[PDB]
Design a protein around this motif. Sequence first.
Motif, PDB file in Angstrom:
ATOM      1  N   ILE A 107      13.530   4.084  -1.568  1.00  0.00           N
ATOM      2  CA  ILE A 107      13.049   3.106  -2.543  1.00  0.00           C
ATOM      3  C   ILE A 107      11.554   2.854  -2.365  1.00  0.00           C
ATOM      4  O   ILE A 107      11.062   2.782  -1.231  1.00  0.00           O
ATOM      5  N   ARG A 108      10.846   2.741  -3.492  1.00  0.00           N
ATOM      6  CA  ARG A 108       9.450   2.299  -3.502  1.00  0.00           C
ATOM      7  C   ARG A 108       9.411   0.776  -3.556  1.00  0.00           C
ATOM      8  O   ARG A 108      10.013   0.157  -4.443  1.00  0.00           O
ATOM      9  N   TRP A 109       8.699   0.171  -2.605  1.00  0.00           N
ATOM     10  CA  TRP A 109       8.651  -1.284  -2.498  1.00  0.00           C
ATOM     11  C   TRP A 109       7.988  -1.931  -3.714  1.00  0.00           C
ATOM     12  O   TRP A 109       8.343  -3.054  -4.100  1.00  0.00           O
ATOM     13  N   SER A 110       7.032  -1.223  -4.311  1.00  0.00           N
ATOM     14  CA  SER A 110       6.376  -1.680  -5.537  1.00  0.00           C
ATOM     15  C   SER A 110       6.831  -0.808  -6.696  1.00  0.00           C
ATOM     16  O   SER A 110       6.656   0.410  -6.669  1.00  0.00           O
TER      17      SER A 110
ATOM     18  N   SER B 115       0.831  -1.214   0.000  1.00  0.00           N
ATOM     19  CA  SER B 115       0.000   0.000   0.000  1.00  0.00           C
ATOM     20  C   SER B 115       0.862   1.260   0.000  1.00  0.00           C
ATOM     21  O   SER B 115       0.975   1.963   1.006  1.00  0.00           O
ATOM     22  N   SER B 116       1.481   1.526  -1.150  1.00  0.00           N
ATOM     23  CA  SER B 116       2.379   2.664  -1.354  1.00  0.00           C
ATOM     24  C   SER B 116       3.457   2.731  -0.280  1.00  0.00           C
ATOM     25  O   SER B 116       3.746   3.800   0.259  1.00  0.00           O
ATOM     26  N   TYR B 117       4.057   1.576   0.001  1.00  0.00           N
ATOM     27  CA  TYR B 117       5.076   1.460   1.036  1.00  0.00           C
ATOM     28  C   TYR B 117       6.434   1.887   0.484  1.00  0.00           C
ATOM     29  O   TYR B 117       6.813   1.504  -0.631  1.00  0.00           O
ATOM     30  N   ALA B 118       7.155   2.685   1.271  1.00  0.00           N
ATOM     31  CA  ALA B 118       8.490   3.161   0.911  1.00  0.00           C
ATOM     32  C   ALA B 118       9.434   3.003   2.084  1.00  0.00           C
ATOM     33  O   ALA B 118       9.020   3.114   3.239  1.00  0.00           O
ATOM     34  N   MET B 119      10.704   2.748   1.783  1.00  0.00           N
ATOM     35  CA  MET B 119      11.737   2.733   2.809  1.00  0.00           C
ATOM     36  C   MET B 119      12.865   3.669   2.409  1.00  0.00           C
ATOM     37  O   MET B 119      13.130   3.877   1.219  1.00  0.00           O
ATOM     38  N   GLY B 120      13.522   4.239   3.412  1.00  0.00           N
ATOM     39  CA  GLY B 120      14.629   5.150   3.173  1.00  0.00           C
ATOM     40  C   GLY B 120      15.743   5.030   4.188  1.00  0.00           C
ATOM     41  O   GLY B 120      15.593   4.398   5.247  1.00  0.00           O
ATOM     42  N   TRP B 121      16.873   5.626   3.836  1.00  0.00           N
ATOM     43  CA  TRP B 121      17.988   5.796   4.748  1.00  0.00           C
ATOM     44  C   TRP B 121      18.258   7.277   4.938  1.00  0.00           C
ATOM     45  O   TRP B 121      18.291   8.044   3.974  1.00  0.00           O
ATOM     46  N   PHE B 122      18.423   7.656   6.202  1.00  0.00           N
ATOM     47  CA  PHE B 122      18.855   8.990   6.600  1.00  0.00           C
ATOM     48  C   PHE B 122      20.143   8.855   7.405  1.00  0.00           C
ATOM     49  O   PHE B 122      20.455   7.779   7.912  1.00  0.00           O
ATOM     50  N   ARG B 123      20.897   9.940   7.520  1.00  0.00           N
ATOM     51  CA  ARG B 123      22.095   9.898   8.348  1.00  0.00           C
ATOM     52  C   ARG B 123      22.322  11.209   9.069  1.00  0.00           C
ATOM     53  O   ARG B 123      21.926  12.269   8.585  1.00  0.00           O
ATOM     54  N   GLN B 124      22.972  11.121  10.224  1.00  0.00           N
ATOM     55  CA  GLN B 124      23.278  12.305  11.018  1.00  0.00           C
ATOM     56  C   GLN B 124      24.745  12.309  11.415  1.00  0.00           C
ATOM     57  O   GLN B 124      25.173  11.505  12.237  1.00  0.00           O
ATOM     58  N   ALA B 125      25.504  13.208  10.797  1.00  0.00           N
ATOM     59  CA  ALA B 125      26.907  13.409  11.129  1.00  0.00           C
ATOM     60  C   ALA B 125      27.021  14.384  12.308  1.00  0.00           C
ATOM     61  O   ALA B 125      26.069  15.119  12.591  1.00  0.00           O
ATOM     62  N   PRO B 126      28.169  14.382  13.014  1.00  0.00           N
ATOM     63  CA  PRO B 126      28.375  15.319  14.127  1.00  0.00           C
ATOM     64  C   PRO B 126      28.091  16.777  13.760  1.00  0.00           C
ATOM     65  O   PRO B 126      28.557  17.266  12.728  1.00  0.00           O
ATOM     66  N   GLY B 127      27.300  17.448  14.598  1.00  0.00           N
ATOM     67  CA  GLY B 127      26.962  18.859  14.415  1.00  0.00           C
ATOM     68  C   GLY B 127      26.002  19.154  13.279  1.00  0.00           C
ATOM     69  O   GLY B 127      25.784  20.320  12.922  1.00  0.00           O
ATOM     70  N   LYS B 128      25.417  18.101  12.716  1.00  0.00           N
ATOM     71  CA  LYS B 128      24.576  18.237  11.540  1.00  0.00           C
ATOM     72  C   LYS B 128      23.167  17.716  11.773  1.00  0.00           C
ATOM     73  O   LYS B 128      22.908  16.938  12.698  1.00  0.00           O
ATOM     74  N   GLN B 129      22.262  18.183  10.920  1.00  0.00           N
ATOM     75  CA  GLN B 129      20.884  17.713  10.858  1.00  0.00           C
ATOM     76  C   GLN B 129      20.825  16.267  10.363  1.00  0.00           C
ATOM     77  O   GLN B 129      21.778  15.774   9.756  1.00  0.00           O
TER      78      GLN B 129
END
Length: 126
Positions: free
Chosen positions: A51-54, A30-44
Amino acid sequence: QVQLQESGGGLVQPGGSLRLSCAASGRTFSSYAMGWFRQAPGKQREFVAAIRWSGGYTYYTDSVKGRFTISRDTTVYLQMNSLKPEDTAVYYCAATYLSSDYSRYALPQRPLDYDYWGQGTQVTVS
């Protein structure tokens, strides 16, 4: 809803490669998506890839395009090649069910656009 668990975190030497994994428990449709985020020192917390699963639509942030690959198997992977000290960060897996009217070949990039989050895992390039 999905529960998310990262693995593959840790140290790697400059010029090496590393693969992160994130296993999703729950219904991955059902419009499922997965992602990767990252947080370096002193950063957002910054967008890395998603990726879209379908249908398999993917998008990468400019600084990782050509070096990182996001893929599916239940599990999303982030294959990280030609690693540099500046890739050091806590990496978070995220997932969401996109609204019913979403384009089938589109992905959001803001952290608050993703409803489900892993706890994060440290990657250190040193």
